[PDB]
Structure 1
């Protein structure tokens, strides 16, 4: 079911099998981290277009013992053979996203598996053999697919029809429909090999060199030395405060936390509870806020190891006011340029503001969350950049490679320019909300740049409007990053949309799904966990109740 309640454990994932697997891990004494790993593998199996060991993600973990919140950063790095103008042709103009998404240089160094390694060596309590076996037997013996997978295959037949993925997903040229069984023998082989040799086989073994060869064959410049040079990082979350709660989220190289918190700070003083959850005022103010935030994102966000992001000025109260001057109910801001936070901050941008064309299909990830009986809290957002990533299947291994490096700017000079060993700017937002410095909520969503809007709104809907968790998730969302791009979910009143367009907005004719939030609420005063999965997909929440003497 989409909503469940537990007392000793709780799991919320995008695929039911992964949910029941993680729940099983919790059931026989495992913790939230073990479950997180098992769920990662199960998601690799059942939803290979969203997450994988050929991709990367951000894993937020709240430790039950040390009471510390840390982040396993497994973002992909560019090879040192990667160049700033590698997204430009010989004529100095931007290669279309359709070709960029599938090319060799779009592939970054996969970091997921090493992230799982670090997580297992820090908080792991069960043998990873046990954690990977169910996924192995899920790829070996097959499984009946869901509607999301089938629709994804049918919508991306063309990308899959040029790689080693056809003979698996397009048997005779026909995509596997809902109910069809998906068998992945080669994937099972890779999982078994990893079960044998560990991460060694991936980063210093046959799998690595194979990935290298197929990448170079697709025009890439990645070497096995690039793989063997890779290490995950550990990040301290970015902190904000909203209506008495402390919010912990993802800092650079992700843009999620900073500007989600910025949107919160910007819209807080308008008190949206004053208006109706489907009124003109709320939607309008949301849009006006998002424009400013994304405007800043397009100019000030990038890998902190390479460029300086002005966090301190992006969240400064006086700066927030200065930007709030541009937000009003009586008019619409038609000149949406990035603000100047550097006033309120020591330092100077070591780059320039470089305009980018908006040729970006927006990609989808997967987010999941786990909670155990020891106060450990896991909120993991993992991704290959887009559905099936590049589409490139590692030959003989049945593994999809990401196109994460497209998250870089096509035109160099900016903070998010292509640099070697540099991590591309992400929009993912794994987030944990605390009260009295103790975890009470988990928020996270997939869908590239829209994620920030999905989380924000959700959080808003939960605290400003005080709605229930499922109501906060299911409450229709909107998205806009410019005066040209607008999206709205099914649920917005037609007259309100029409008036919004009369005010200068550009909402389209038909609605689309925005994000997919899985969340876990921690009710300590009732000693239970509540799990909710978004209806946008076939997500699932499963609770765990363990008897004493067990």
Structure 2
């Protein structure tokens, strides 16, 4: 029996898969810290929740350091390869390739960062070796585990794109999707984890794996090279901070839109004193929906990778800008043409990009 709520005196783990939570908790019980446990959990989720994350991808890992009292983010968001181009998702007529078609092409594959992120996290805060931490996941991959309902539904839902690639041998053996309770065995992933254990992250970013990954991306139409993999490094990001209702909030900056617009929606909604409305009242949902429209419009207009583009952060969160936006919201009427605001009236500078509506 696993539970979805727990309490403890000496630490806590919460993940989307019981086997991963077990592995993270085990690390802590054996004297590892939260960063060691988080690294072990990522490997475990890579095996047991393989549709959602892993060393083929990237992420944002926010860590509060209990010794230095600093909060920092290991940003392992994937990079576009050197051969990527602004128009790479357009057809010959200069119109967007339909999303569902884009998803399965090699051009969609970013240079993976997750493994580089785990290595950096251990370098900064680790007290356990990557060799210790990856070992339980090598065993889950090699020996297998019975698949949960979420995984089973995923294999079924995504049967078509899995059927087009080498993934078919793992998830659709004999041409049939594995069912809830069936054993999933991932021998090749096990082998890859053994190579990482023996040779370090070079097993991934260099050598035969890097060549094979690159060649495969190219077979599916993408431009990624071995040099792209060699060039990759994570970035250390400073959180963006805001105040809400007596709390300081540390959240994720560009290249995520998440922190700025979490803070902006909180700031807009804080004007309304939402608790005055019952938690299931139409008034509450109205105010939520209207705020979301304004903030998501700003996101579409103004957010991108801050190594490349000017995100008007000061402007977007300026108390006077918030006021302007909040003033656009009524209980009894809906904005039928919500648009981005002009955060540039509330800070210096200008966009080094244009306003282009997406299909």
Same fold (TM over 0.5): yes
Deviation at 1:330, TM superposition (A): 2.4
Is 1:140–2:142 an aligned residue pair? yes
Shift of 1:111: 0.3
What do residues 28-52 of structure 1 show as CA deviations (whole Å, max 9, x unaligned)? 1000000000000000000111001
Deviates more, 1:325-334 or 1:192-201: 325-334
Alignment of 1:400-479 (within 5 A): none
Between the aligned partners of 1:83 and 1:168, the Cα distance in structure 2 is 33
Instruction: Decide whether the 8 Å contact of 2:138 with 2:190 is kept in 1.
Output: yes
What residue in structure 2 maps to residue 66 of structure 1?
A: 68
Secondary structure of the structure 2 residue equivalent to 1:277: coil
Match of 1:313 in 2: 315
Q: C-alpha root-mean-square deviation of aligned residues, in Å?
A: 0.6
8 Å contact kept, 2:109–2:217:
yes
Aligned residues between the structures: 357
The SS at the match of 1:87 is coil
Alpha-carbon separation, structure 1, partners of 2:89 and 2:237: 29
8 Å CA contact retained: 2:316, 2:343: yes
SS at match of 1:208: helix
- 8 Å Cα contact 2:62-2:72 kept in structure 1: yes
Q: CA deviation at 1:206?
A: 1.4
SS of the residue 2:174 aligns to: coil
Task: Name the SS of the counterpart of 1:86 in structure 2.
Answer: coil
Q: Alignment partner for residue 188 of structure 1, among 190, 195, 206? A: 190
Q: In structure 2, how many angstroms separate the alpha carbons of the residues matched to 1:159 and 1:43?
A: 21
The structure 1 segments of at least 4 consecutive aligned residues displaced by more than 4 Å after TM superposition are none
Check whether the contact 2:271–2:326 (CA below 8 A) recurs between aligned residues.
Answer: no
The answer for the alignment partner of 1:445 in structure 2 is: none
Query: Which whole-Å CA distance do the structure 2 matches of 1:2 and 1:330 have between them?
Result: 39
Give the SS at the match of 1:299: helix
Q: Does 1:17 align with 2:19?
A: yes
Three-state SS of the structure 2 residue aligned to 1:353 is coil
Quote the offset at 1:63 in angstroms. 0.3
Which residue in 2 is equivalent to 1:349? 351
Structure 2 stretches of 5 or more lacking a match?
A: none
Q: TM-score, normalising length from structure 2?
A: 0.99
* Equivalent of 2:43 in 41, 44, 48: 41
- The answer to whether the aligner puts 1:96 opposite 2:98 as a matched pair is yes
Equivalent residue for 1:230, pick from 232, 240, 259: 232
Cα distance in 2 for partners of 1:241, 1:284 equals 24
CA shift digits 1:52-71 (9 cap, x unpaired): 10100000000011100000
What corresponds to 1:84 in structure 2? Answer: 86
* Structure 2 residue 263 is the aligned partner of structure 1 residue 253: no
1:367-378 alignment runs, 5 A limit: none
State how far apart, in whole Å, the 2-side matches of 1:244 and 1:4 are: 26
1:120 matched residue in structure 2: 122
* Partner in structure 1 of residue 155 of structure 2: 153
**Contact 2:119-2:130 at 8 Å conserved across structures:** no
Aligned residue for 1:5, secondary structure, equals: strand
Q: For 2:178, which of 176, 179, 203 is the aligned residue?
A: 176
Structure 1 residue 332, shift from structure 2 partner: 1.1
Q: Which runs of 5+ in 1 are unaligned?
A: 358-550
Aligned mates of 1:335, 1:162 — CA distance in 2: 41
Q: Greater strand percent: which structure?
A: 1
- Tell me the CA shift for residue 324 of structure 1: 1.1
Q: CA deviation at 1:295?
A: 0.5
Three-state SS of the structure 2 residue aligned to 1:12 is strand
